[PDB]
Write a protein that binds this ligand. Structure first.
Ligand SMILES: CC(C)(Nc1nc(-c2c[nH]c3ncc(Cl)cc23)ncc1F)C(=O)NCC(F)(F)F
Length: 289
């Protein structure tokens, strides 16, 4: 079934980035304001390269059906082929980052692990399709309700080549470097293993309860020196990672959860755990607790 542009009523801006913008809209064909509230993504500056990447993100999202992956709803073509709109489910609790920042320690360790398990499961399913998320962070995870989180924003997702286990980005855009694996920093190489490294960073964010002074950019900047600027930050971060500088164990975090983070943060790509293993391990910790 099709979505008519004339029936998409603007409600609120949700955000912007990666050459796109996301708005909360009511899909109201009955024109009585009883329509479903949806999330609508469109391109801000729509070049032929941007259209091509947007179409690929649409195909990727439409191919994914999992409880812990944001639902594709459709496409609106009313403005023509060159001005597509991606329609997705709207998750009113917003990002896990905002949700956790608000609700802090009132969300216990058992609950953080329920979210951790769901993130692993969504990521494992993503990996079976040979898709590399490339932007795993609490800011890119949505809360559906108290018991369910879902991976969102597939705007940076790459499909692995048929004959290779990594995707090489020739001309990188804005990069979340404090979530990046060393091979992604040095060679712009992305794989299931680099998504596992970013997952270790997600687990860290969770157990610091999004405390501002404890964030991966704040911790890494203190380790390299706050006087470092521009490309010198990347140069120093690479050398720090090479010499085993890592994020600290968050205050009150169980030893066992810190060990999972440190295994994800292995410089050897082949030694990092698998998402299938992580979900099994995290479910065992949950059960024990
Ligand atoms: C608005 C913003 C910067 N970007 C996007 N949101 C949604 C999106 C899809 N459904 C949503 N429902 C609620 C909210 Cl707050 C956002 C969305 N889908 C794609 C995006 F690029 C965002 O919130 N990102 C967090 C993420 F969704 F990725 F987890």
């Amino acid at each position: 079934t099709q979505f008519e542009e004339r029936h998409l009523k603007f409600l609120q801006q949700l955000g912007k980035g990666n050459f796109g913008s996301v708005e909360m809209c009511r899909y109201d064909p009955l024109q009585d304001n009883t329509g479903e509230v949806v999330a609508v993504k469109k391109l801000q500056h729509s070049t032929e390269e941007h259209l091509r990447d947007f179409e690929r993100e649409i195909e990727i999202l439409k191919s994914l059906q999992h409880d812990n992956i944001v639902k594709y709803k459709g496409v609106c073509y009313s403005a023509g082929r060159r001005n597509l709109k991606l329609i997705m489910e709207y998750l009113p609790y917003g990002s896990l980052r905002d949700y956790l920042q608000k609700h802090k320690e009132r969300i216990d360790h058992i609950k953080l692990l329920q979210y951790t398990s769901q993130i692993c499961k969504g990521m494992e399913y993503l990996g079976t399709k040979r898709y590399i998320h490339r932007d795993l962070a609490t800011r890119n995870i949505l809360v559906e309700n108290e018991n369910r989180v879902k991976i969102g924003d597939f705007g940076l997702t790459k499909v692995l080549p048929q004959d290779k286990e990594y995707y090489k980005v020739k001309e990188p855009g804005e990069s979340p470097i404090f979530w990046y694996a060393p091979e992604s920093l040095t060679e712009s190489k992305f794989s299931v293993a680099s998504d596992v490294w970013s997952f270790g960073v997600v687990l860290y964010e969770l157990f610091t309860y999004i405390e501002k002074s404890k964030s991966p950019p704040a911790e890494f900047m203190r380790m390299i020196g706050n006087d470092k600027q521009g490309q010198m930050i990347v140069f120093h971060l690479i050398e720090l990672l090479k010499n085993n500088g890592r994020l600290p164990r968050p205050d009150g975090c169980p030893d066992e959860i810190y060990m999972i983070m440190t295994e994800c943060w292995n410089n050897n790509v082949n030694q990092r755990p698998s998402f299938r293993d992580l979900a099994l391990r995290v479910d065992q910790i949950r059960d024990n607790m």
